[PDB]
Design a protein around this ligand. Structure first.
Ligand SMILES: C[As](C)(=O)[O-]
Length: 213
C-alpha cells in the first residue's frame, strides 16, 4: 500500500551534507576510512536498533545511520519520513574482514528481521523500512551477487514458513538511483546509546515504565 514516488516527483533535497563533520562513534570511538576495512550497507527496518546490532558485532569497527536506495540528495530525516525520497533506512557497517566476513554480516542481517514484508518491517509501515543490502568497493557487483546467493538460500525456508517471496533489494550502492549513501543528523548516530530512555517505536511494554530492556 505504500509506494515509491516517481523520481520526477521526489523531494529535491540539497547539494550539501546534512552532517558534514560526523563525530567519532559514541561506542567504538572511530570514524570511517580505516585502511584494510570493507563496507556493507544494511537495511532491516528502524535503523536505531539495527545500528546497535551491528556496532556490537565482533569485527565491526565503525557504523553510522542514514539513507540510501532512493533518489533525493542529502535528505533530512524529516524529509525521508515523508516517503517522498524513496530512500530506505540504512546502517553503514564498516568491518575488518579478517575478523568478520561479508557472508557473516549478510546472514546476521537476514536473521535479524523479516525479509519478506515489502514496504514495512513489523509495525513500521513505509518504503523507508524496506529490506536492503547495498554493496561497495572494487568488487561491489561480485559482492552483490554473493549476497543474492546467500539471500536466495533462505527462500525455501521462508516459503515453508508461509511467508511468500523475499523482498530484499540487493545491488551496488553506486547503482542505486542517487548512487550514494547520506548520513542522518548527528542525533540519530548511536541514538540508543546516547539516549538510553529511547527505543524503536512500537516496542513499548506493559510493565515497569513501558521502556523495553
Ligand atoms: C529510526 As525510526 C523512529 O524512523 O524507526
Amino acid at each position: 500500500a505504500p509506494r515509491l514516488v516517481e523520481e520526477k516527483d521526489a523531494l529535491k533535497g540539497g547539494p550539501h551534507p546534512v552532517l558534514p563533520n560526523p563525530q567519532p562513534h559514541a561506542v567504538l570511538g572511530t570514524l570511517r576510512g580505516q585502511p584494510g576495512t570493507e563496507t556493507i550497507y544494511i537495511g532491516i527496518g528502524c535503523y536505531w536498533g539495527a545500528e546497535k546490532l551491528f556496532w556490537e558485532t565482533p569485527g565491526v569497527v565503525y557504523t553510522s545511520v542514514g539513507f540510501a536506495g532512493g533518489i533525493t540528495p542529502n535528505p533530512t530525516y524529516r524529509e525521508t519520513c515523508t516517503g517522498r525520497t524513496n530512500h530506505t533506512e540504512i546502517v553503514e557497517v564498516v568491518y575488518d574482514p579478517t575478523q568478520v566476513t561479508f557472508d557473516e554480516l549478510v546472514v546476521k542481517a537476514m536473521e535479524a528481521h523479516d525479509p519478506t514484508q515489502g514496504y514495512r518491517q513489523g509495525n513500521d509501515t513505509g518504503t523507508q523500512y524496506r529490506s536492503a543490502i547495498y554493496t561497495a568497493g572494487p568488487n561491489a557487483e561480485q559482492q552483490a551477487q554473493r549476497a543474492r546467493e546467500i539471500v536466495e538460500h533462505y527462500a525455501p525456508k521462508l516459503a515453508a514458513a508461509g511467508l511468500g517471496r523475499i523482498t530484499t533489494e540487493i545491488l551496488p550502492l553506486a547503482s542505486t538511483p542517487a548512487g550514494e549513501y547520506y548520513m542522518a543528523e548527528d542525533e540519530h548516530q548511536q541514538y540508543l546509546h546516547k539516549n538510553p530512555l529511547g527505543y524503536c517505536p512500537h516496542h513499548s511494554t506493559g510493565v515497569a515504565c513501558g521502556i523495553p530492556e
